[PDB]
Design a protein around this nucleic acid. Sequence first.
RNA 1: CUUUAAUGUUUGAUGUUCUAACGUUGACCCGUAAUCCGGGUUGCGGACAGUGUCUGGUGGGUAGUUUGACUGGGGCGGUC
RNA 2: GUUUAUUAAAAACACAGCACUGUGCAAACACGAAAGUGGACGUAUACGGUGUGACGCCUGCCCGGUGCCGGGAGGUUAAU
RNA 3: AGGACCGAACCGACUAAUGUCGAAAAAUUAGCGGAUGACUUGUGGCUGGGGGUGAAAGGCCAAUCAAACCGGGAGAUAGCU
Lengths: 77, 46, 271, 149
Amino acid sequence: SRVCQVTGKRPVTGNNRSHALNATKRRFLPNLHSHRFWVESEKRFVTLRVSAKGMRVIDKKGIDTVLAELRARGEKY
Amino acid sequence: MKRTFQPSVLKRNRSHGFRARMATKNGRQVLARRRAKGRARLTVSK
Amino acid sequence: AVVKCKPTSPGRRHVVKVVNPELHKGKPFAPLLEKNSKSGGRNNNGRITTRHIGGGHKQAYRIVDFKRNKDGIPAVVERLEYDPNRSANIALVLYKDGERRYILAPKGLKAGDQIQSGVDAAIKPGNTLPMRNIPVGSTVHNVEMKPGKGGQLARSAGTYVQIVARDGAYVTLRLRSGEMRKVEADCRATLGEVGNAEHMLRVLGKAGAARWRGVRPTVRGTAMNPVDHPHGGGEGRNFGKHPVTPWGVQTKGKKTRSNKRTDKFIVRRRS
Amino acid sequence: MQVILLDKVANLGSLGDQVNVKAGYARNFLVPQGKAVPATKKNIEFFEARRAELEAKLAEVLAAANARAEKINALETVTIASKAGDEGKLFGSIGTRDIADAVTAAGVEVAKSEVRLPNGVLRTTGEHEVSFQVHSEVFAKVIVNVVAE
RNA sequence: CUUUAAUGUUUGAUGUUCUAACGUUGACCCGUAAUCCGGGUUGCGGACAGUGUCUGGUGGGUAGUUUGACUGGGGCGGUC
RNA sequence: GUUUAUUAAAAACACAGCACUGUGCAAACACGAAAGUGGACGUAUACGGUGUGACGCCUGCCCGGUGCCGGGAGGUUAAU
RNA sequence: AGGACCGAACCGACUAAUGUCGAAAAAUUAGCGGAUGACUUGUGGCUGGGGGUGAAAGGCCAAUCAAACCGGGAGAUAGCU
């Protein structure tokens, strides 16, 4: 699914309002992308479907720390 | 005058049989509803 | 050869037949055959995705070697055969090592002809060489998009491409549509023109001829009701609308190419 | 992004200077290749402690070894015999596979990625010049004379 | 201030080149008696394409609706 | 030849042929939130759409308006 | 050889009469068209409701179709009888 593997962002439904305030159901999608991150601890590349915000989160923290949290979450990466 | 109903045991079982209902969740709900109503015949049994 | 049959009955008056006396009168080579189940225009969802497809004669699939990777092995053309899956006839070729294969038959082939692949090959028609070794201005067919892909251009009967220029590692080809495309010099191509150039002279004659070829009748949009087609409706053949596809897209002169990825390889468009 | 640099970056390399860089540049090039390490209020103390000069010599010896290696073959000449065609049209284009293998067998033991070809893929038959880069600041020139067979 | 010019600053448009993001329905190897998929090597494109958020244009392809009353039946015309 | 099963079998629909138009192959297009599938294990002598409707003579003038294709002098013009 | 000819089985339904609380919720009798093909048929699959399929009639989709059937919102609303 369109779920970020780091921040957990998932599509959220909402409305779009016209000038006449007409409301139609829409859906907001996270800015997901497939990226390969190099991990020195295991010395290989890991592919994660992460959002742009998640990629910023990975940069701010360590890739090792994020992987540990993912492992604790219980979902394989 | 050919009529709408042309019996065929194989087609009847493979279409409305017990295993056909259990394949999908909608069929499982059909069985669940008919168990609740207490119907003697859950499905078309050969 | 083109033969006009006598009008002994309606349905034969306008039939023009193409007869090839050298075509093999017998069963094909079984080891290179495969079943070809028809689809009727339906996809995995079971819905009609392409219209006017269905029925027709059963036809098996011949594994035609487009890659032509047997480098350095001389081969001899055993015979020419009719391929129901293609407009062009195929040729069964036996290599010196005892292997048989199917290839598209250019105009010049005949039984017993010698063909060779690889860079160390002659210039006679039927030989496949990388386009770098092919002299500029020559006519080739079965050109490859990418090295090892197999060959996708000039595959129909009586088709070919022109090599016009060679800059650096890329080559410019003029396709039968009048479009100039830039291709890698490593791609292979087959010298000569695809055979059966008279395949376009047939007329099929009657309605049944197109019917057992796999084509179903086409219904005009005007003949339909408004709910079915953007055209249609009204009494007495009223149109009053711009021509459009059944799904609303404007046909009759609207460009639909939207790739932005292969445009770098296009030098000129159709005119 | 504020990062500390280890290797000599040709543009802004100064051995661990807090210099901003694009996130993509560090994420995709520097960090994976070991040319830098993300430092955010935690590794700055560590860099100035054990990375300050301890690895400076370790980094330098790699350049010294590279300089030694590229002078292993004083001849700096490569000769390969190929069955070229009649009056040009060499049999097939050759890049780095054959030349590197021949050099490795008899000459300088170098990796595949080291060899760079500035004059194409050696299409024409004759004398050609090949630029070898064993280091960012170390460039070597080798003359290759392919001879038709 | 009007009139001009060396080095350094913010720079943004354009152009060329590169590879390390990204794409690969190119080839080859392995998981594997596998035209799926994944990993590896290499080739070709390459910061383009593509995707997310915002925004202009187009949009009966689709949807929800409106389209007045008087009236010597109604409509037309006239009137309010 | 096909059609309103059950008041219309026809001049209606289809048809071979003809023309216009789109599509270079990860094709156009279609079904799918997507993956994917059909087109096609085909690739321009091919495929899709549209109109006309065997064959013979042919098919005139008009680009104002609305579409479609190309242009860029100048004006107006969103997010930011 | 033939979407060739005449004509049974088979498929279809142009005309007339009978039948309309019929033998039959479209039939019977006498004629009628195709009948080696774009034919017909058995068995089994696939396409699902704003969708399918349609040599295109708004035809067909279980005797029901300008939006099937069943249950639910639902005791919808009804300035009308």
